[PDB]
Design an enzyme around this catalytic site. Sequence first.
Site, mmCIF file in Angstrom:
data_model
loop_
_atom_site.group_PDB
_atom_site.id
_atom_site.type_symbol
_atom_site.label_atom_id
_atom_site.label_comp_id
_atom_site.label_asym_id
_atom_site.label_seq_id
_atom_site.Cartn_x
_atom_site.Cartn_y
_atom_site.Cartn_z
ATOM 1 C CB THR E 93 13.394 16.669 91.637
ATOM 2 O OG1 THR E 93 12.830 16.752 92.948
ATOM 3 C CG2 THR E 93 14.788 17.358 91.660
ATOM 4 C CG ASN E 120 3.744 19.576 98.843
ATOM 5 O OD1 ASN E 120 4.507 18.698 99.301
ATOM 6 N ND2 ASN E 120 3.565 19.756 97.538
ATOM 7 C CB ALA E 123 6.727 20.255 97.123
ATOM 8 C CE1 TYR E 127 10.479 23.356 93.065
ATOM 9 C CE2 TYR E 127 8.731 23.088 94.694
ATOM 10 C CZ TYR E 127 9.200 22.962 93.396
ATOM 11 O OH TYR E 127 8.392 22.445 92.420
#
Lengths: 169, 163, 164, 163, 164, 169, 169, 169, 163, 164, 164, 163
Positions: E93, E120, E123, E127
């Site tokens: 991050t 995933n 992740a 985002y």
Amino acid sequence: MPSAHSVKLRPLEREDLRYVHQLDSVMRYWFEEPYEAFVELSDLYDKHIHDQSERRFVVECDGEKAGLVELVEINHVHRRAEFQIIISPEYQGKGLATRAAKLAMDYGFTVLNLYKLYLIVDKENEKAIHIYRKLGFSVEGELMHEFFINGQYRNAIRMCIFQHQYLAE
Amino acid sequence: HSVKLRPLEREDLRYVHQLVMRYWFEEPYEAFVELSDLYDKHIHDQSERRFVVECDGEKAGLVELVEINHVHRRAEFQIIISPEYQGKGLATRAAKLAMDYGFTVLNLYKLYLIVDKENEKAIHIYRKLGFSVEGELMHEFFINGQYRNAIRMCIFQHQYLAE
Amino acid sequence: HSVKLRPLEREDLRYVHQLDVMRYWFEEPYEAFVELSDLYDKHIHDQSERRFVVECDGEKAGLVELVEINHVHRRAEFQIIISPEYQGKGLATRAAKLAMDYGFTVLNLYKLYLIVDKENEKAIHIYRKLGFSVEGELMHEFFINGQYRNAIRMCIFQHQYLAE
Amino acid sequence: HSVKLRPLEREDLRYVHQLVMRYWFEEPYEAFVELSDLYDKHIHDQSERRFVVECDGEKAGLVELVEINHVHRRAEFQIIISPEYQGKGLATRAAKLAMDYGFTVLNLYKLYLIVDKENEKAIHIYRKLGFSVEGELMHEFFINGQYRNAIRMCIFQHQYLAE
Amino acid sequence: HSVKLRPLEREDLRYVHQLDVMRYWFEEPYEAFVELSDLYDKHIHDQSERRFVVECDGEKAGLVELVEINHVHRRAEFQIIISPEYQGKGLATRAAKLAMDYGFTVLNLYKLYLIVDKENEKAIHIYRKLGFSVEGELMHEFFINGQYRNAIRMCIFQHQYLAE
Amino acid sequence: MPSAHSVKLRPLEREDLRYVHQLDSVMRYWFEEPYEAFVELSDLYDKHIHDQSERRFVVECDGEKAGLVELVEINHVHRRAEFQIIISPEYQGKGLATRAAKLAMDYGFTVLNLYKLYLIVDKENEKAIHIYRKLGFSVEGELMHEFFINGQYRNAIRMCIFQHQYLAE
Amino acid sequence: MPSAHSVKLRPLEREDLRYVHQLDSVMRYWFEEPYEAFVELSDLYDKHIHDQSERRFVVECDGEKAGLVELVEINHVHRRAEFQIIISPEYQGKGLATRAAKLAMDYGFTVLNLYKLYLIVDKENEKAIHIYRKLGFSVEGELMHEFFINGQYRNAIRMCIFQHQYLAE
Amino acid sequence: MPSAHSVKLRPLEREDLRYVHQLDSVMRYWFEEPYEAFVELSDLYDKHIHDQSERRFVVECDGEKAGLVELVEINHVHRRAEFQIIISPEYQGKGLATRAAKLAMDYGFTVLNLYKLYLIVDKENEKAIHIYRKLGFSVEGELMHEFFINGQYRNAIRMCIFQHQYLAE
Amino acid sequence: HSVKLRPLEREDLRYVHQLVMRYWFEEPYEAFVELSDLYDKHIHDQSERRFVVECDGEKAGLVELVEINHVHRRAEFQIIISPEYQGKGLATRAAKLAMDYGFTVLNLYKLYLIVDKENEKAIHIYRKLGFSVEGELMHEFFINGQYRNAIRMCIFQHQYLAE
Amino acid sequence: HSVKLRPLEREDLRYVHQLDVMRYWFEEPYEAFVELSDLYDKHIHDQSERRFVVECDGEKAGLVELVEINHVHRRAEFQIIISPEYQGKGLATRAAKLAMDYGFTVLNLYKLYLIVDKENEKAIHIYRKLGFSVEGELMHEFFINGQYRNAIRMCIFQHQYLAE
Amino acid sequence: HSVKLRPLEREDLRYVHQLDVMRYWFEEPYEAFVELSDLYDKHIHDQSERRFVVECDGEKAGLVELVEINHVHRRAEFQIIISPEYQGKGLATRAAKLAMDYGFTVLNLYKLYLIVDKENEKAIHIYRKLGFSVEGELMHEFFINGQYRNAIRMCIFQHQYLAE
Amino acid sequence: HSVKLRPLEREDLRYVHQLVMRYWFEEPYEAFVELSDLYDKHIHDQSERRFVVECDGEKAGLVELVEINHVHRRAEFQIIISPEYQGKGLATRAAKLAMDYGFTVLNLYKLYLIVDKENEKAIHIYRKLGFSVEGELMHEFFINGQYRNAIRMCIFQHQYLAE
Ligand SMILES: [Mg+2]
Ligand SMILES: [Mg+2]
């Protein structure tokens, strides 16, 4: 009980080049190009690394460097090459030139798949000549004044042998 | 215990050399300078790929992917173990690893191998791994004074991935 | 009619380019002429392949490729290609005989081999006749026009040639 | 009547040039000397492949295979028709041809394309050829004063070969 | 703990080599170090990619790649990789934030994007939080370890960054 | 009154290279490197332009190109070379190979200052052999299976001659 | 009914290089390197073909070559470039320099995606200055004795404009 | 009695290149070409060793390396250059940037024989601006949004000075 | 009537060639490609200088300055006339010209020449021009089957400039 | 004491450089070592000159140069130089004999020659003794240290050597 | 009649070659065209010399050389040569004025100088008139056609030009 | 006591550098890498020749022969002593040495030098060595803010050799 030496052909590495150079005055050649100084030999060497028309082995006796076999003028369409052997002075006298020849015969004949191998020697060298005969080399020519050596033209005897003779034994 | 399969690095060449006539990218070598030179000439050549076989971190053998083709999606492989590491069937695990790489990473369809006909052990091993025989190549090699026969064997990605 | 092999000159390279979809030079792929000209220039002294134009009465009629030539094991693979308009006159047969002649009576090889589509039962038969042995059947060796095909590998030896 | 698909030759470059900012092997060009030079620099580059579209022997457009990858077995394609040859759905036949080449010759698994969102015709055409939509790339291009959206669409070898 | 980007020096190239199976440099594949050293030397002044070592308290902790950089359309793709032992400390991050900073506040790009495994979900969520949009789902884009996987492409824009 | 032809050695120019190529299937070599296609010959040619170990002449008969003399394996320390002559088909039958040999003898012996010249010929070629004898070449070897030719190993006869014999005449 | 000319930017090809050269004594530069003789220009040209920091167009009027636009000092991080236009003598007098400027604005702003463009002109050129103002260029500096020209230091006016102004119009 | 430091311009050697690199994120350039990694800088450096259009000095304070002067865009027909100075953090605060400017003025004016030198600084840097004025630099332009810096377009002030002013003092 | 002495240009090489073993910068040639190549290799070599001898604008012979040395201020010269131009004592005028060049232009101190002992005419000519004899070089050349003797002769700048 | 010729290695090149004012390599002038190293590298395979270190009991004592070697006319010029400290021990005499030996019994030349200062009546005499002929007196051939000097050229032939 | 300078193109190089005996390019000697072509190619971007064809009514009439150009000391030497057939029409005078113009009003030099034969009292006078100063008499500076000659070096300055 | 004059070797460059704008083969340098590079570019260039001045084996200064020409048989020389070696008239002995080399070894006819007009000592020294004045070059150098005049002085081989 007599101790057995181990005699091997080994592919010639660059680090071997000093050994070659110092096997010795006369003209020496690398890929039919002449050398004298180390820098000449070393540069020829790199220029010819991939060249399939000569191959060189060191003769190790018990792992120590004792002399040199040069297969030269290799021709794979006519399946022949010429060979030349040279034994370091402290390794002469003890049958090495002989074993060393047998080993080069083995290499060309059993590895490289040539059909014929030959050699030149001084007409004067009744010793070597007779040995090669012993091993069943035929005499195929007496070249007259082929080499000018130490002030004087000398005569060479070319002697050959063949794959089938060899494997038959 | 542990067997990885590391890409062939330049430091590995002296090892490689220290394992009859050898080929790099179908060009022959004997001296180490012959192979070294050849090595850099073929650095970005995708047609062959090589790996050291590592047992517990020590260099123990070699996998070669050779004649790699991505339209027909196939390649050949040779595997070589160093003497002191032979006969624990690293030869086997290495084969699986090669198979893993070509089929799961490189996305090949087909893998084949050549072995001397006389090597009945290898022939058996691979048949066990479920390779099928596709040819008996007559006098395909002059080896130590004599022509020898090889057997070519293949296996396919679908067969493997059944896993 | 008379048929000869002839070494392949750069001037032949334009001819070679257009026999029609995927092909190689010294094992590197090519498509455009510029691609091919380049490989050719690169491999001028490469001993491992030798090519020939197949001449029919002094006219370019096809090509013979001698490939994977190995002199230590004394073998080599061959392939022949005949321009569309010279096919079906037993020309690829005469060209085969001629390639054998060259590898056997000039290059002094011991063994020559080729690979054909299993499906091509015709060519296959022509070789068997010539005394070629089947030495293998490769499974799905070639992805061609949408599917994997099988091929047959067939070989012949110098002594068989120099006898018959 | 007849549409072949010939490999792109060096004589074809002046034609290519004679069709906003253009790319050769992801490097940009405008002058013809810029593209010509670039061309030779990428002669043996397998990552892109180009073809002139030939209608009855005349040069009529262009197929580009770009970003070709053989491990993941995919590539992108752009197709360009010259004005005087537009609106007979050569654009279509050309697309099929591209598809034929990548799927039956090159043995790719997947083919995709980018098109301006606004090009509703192309989007429709390709959906007709059974391409599915995989992305709406927001302001992916600055075109004549403005950011524009593209739509990316793909189709797969199994879908095609159903033929 | 403090975290910085740093341009990637040849001295870092040994570090880069061993994060573990298939990878690229300036779009050409590599495996061996010698392969990589070479690409690196070739692309020294290539403007289209820019790399950085991610430093955690002066220690090499990972890498940021800025790839497919286009200045006319003002965008670029990015990817981050963290050495095994620095994972699970929200480091990727902080590295993402830092890559945005660089492309947005230094390179002056308009848009930055990335691609992750659909699978995933973690992740992906990170985002979304950062204000990234999903701009596509690529189907079977990657053959990885034995099967084709899906990926998600997510993008963010300068103005969103310079605002929040 | 019979008309006298003029036969000359001429140094081989590049423009002669097509003529060479098309003197003809067998292995041909340039500086011990093999060729087949014109592009191979031409590139060898440029690679070896300054090389002192082979020299080539065209045989002009009345100014028209009739054949080729190659002095090869030139060695200036042992003062020898090998020669090879080749007469274009439409110039055979009229003593050219002979005159052509005399001219190469003249060149090595009177210009290049070699001490010995030799040649290889097929053991089978009783014609040529006897001619060389006539000119006082000695036979210095019968190389066995030296060439593999049209499917078969053939035997060569090496025959030499010397500067002093030549100038004595 | 008045006939409409068509004025276009065209990417500068090599064949255009003679036209460039002969637009004329003063220092001219290519990629910040100076030229005079054609051979100097042409060699610079090849040395810089792929260089992204200058871009050049010919101005075609009705397909005939009328002048030259040079975008120079292109910087894609600061999103600016400088421009320079030059109209062939027989194409002056008819608004070309103007249209030609509008077109380069269009190129940098709508194609190349720069944020700012500027230009230098002689302080003395009250004509051009006022035109650029008309098009809403701001004045951003008066460089003093920036150019030494025909025996004398002269003053330049740098004037800029921006993408948003342009698209707003 | 206060101790006097000695401040010198020294021609930039290659060994200085590490010092340069580590004066520090922003775009840095060498001969108008951009760098980041050391290998980029070092290769640019060798590519430009003989290039007359930029010259660089290290500022030694008492023989220790304290900062860097770059004369850039050197033009010998218009007799000008731009300069840029940069003081290492541990050498700030003690008048170095000032002395350092005087020294570069001295170099261009008294050694290199330029007629005019200028510099760009942030419009925001009322400190530096006023100093340059103090030294009698004129302001010759306020470039608007010339640099995009840390997320934002910034304004630059270009300020010049002349050989005659300088030697008059 | 008129004799100039023009620098040797590349177009003159075919002429040169068209005049036993020849040397360019002490390297031997026979083919024209051998001499041509050699020529470019020695373009900026100051150690030799060559001139065509022009009679009324036609190429009629050759002067060579060879082994030029500026510390010891000397050089050798060979002069060659083409058959059809021989025996009008161009050989002579050419010699004077060579002498003029080396002594008045090149500022040499000494000029010498080698000639076969048997060439009694040349020996006489040069003695007439006031060259003195400095050596009889025994069997200095193998020429057409036989060793031959040369005579070396020199003259000095002060002797010439007496003019 | 024992005396040998030995081919000259790059390692000898530093030794050669400092025997003390004007000299040549393959006819190009030199002064600095860097100048000399360079010529040497350039002429590695030049057949027209051959050099030797003169070894006195395994110690470098001087140098033999074989220059202007022509194989068609079978001759060559020679020169010898002895380090200051080995002079006056008849060493240049033994070195001369050795150079003859090499050109005559190894290189197979027909003629060898040399040039000495006319004024050097001593060396001159030593050669005459060895059976060398005077074949010329070159007038003002060398500008040396402020004045033109005369030299003598003296030659000997293979058959004279191989006889006596 | 009208007279201009014009930068010297490769196409002019044949013209330059034949104005008739010893000359230089970028300080290296030349004689043959091939020699000259080569220097020219080598010095294309050399800033230290600049040449011009002197055009008389669009016809090549001579040449102006600006030599030893130094920008730090702001000076340069010049020389003019007029084809035989354009001499005696005050052309070398107009050419001189033009060379001054260029170095002074374009190149921005401070000083221009030239060297002439002392014996050439005519040219000498023409320069004095133009306001040139004698700044030296070099003794035996040139060996020309059999004897050492003296030369005069004369200079003029920008401010003198820009005034008158 | 002892002053030799050794050829300039590559190890001497760092010394050279460690002695306003400098020239190597008429190309300017400041950095040591600038001069080093320049040095190898001009290794076989005969137009300049350099020597370290050695006092009792230590490096103490520099003689430069510059603009060497062998047709007109002249050259220029600069001589530079290091501070700690100045004012024992090494400057003088060095001058003699230069003169010795150019006149007795290199066989030049004429040697000249440039010196700032203001350097009345040097001007006097050389006049003592019997150099004659041949020019007062007005504002020939911009030095530290100002144009300066140089004086050029020469002497001739016959004058020297009177010794
Ligand atoms: Mg041979
Ligand atoms: Mg700039």
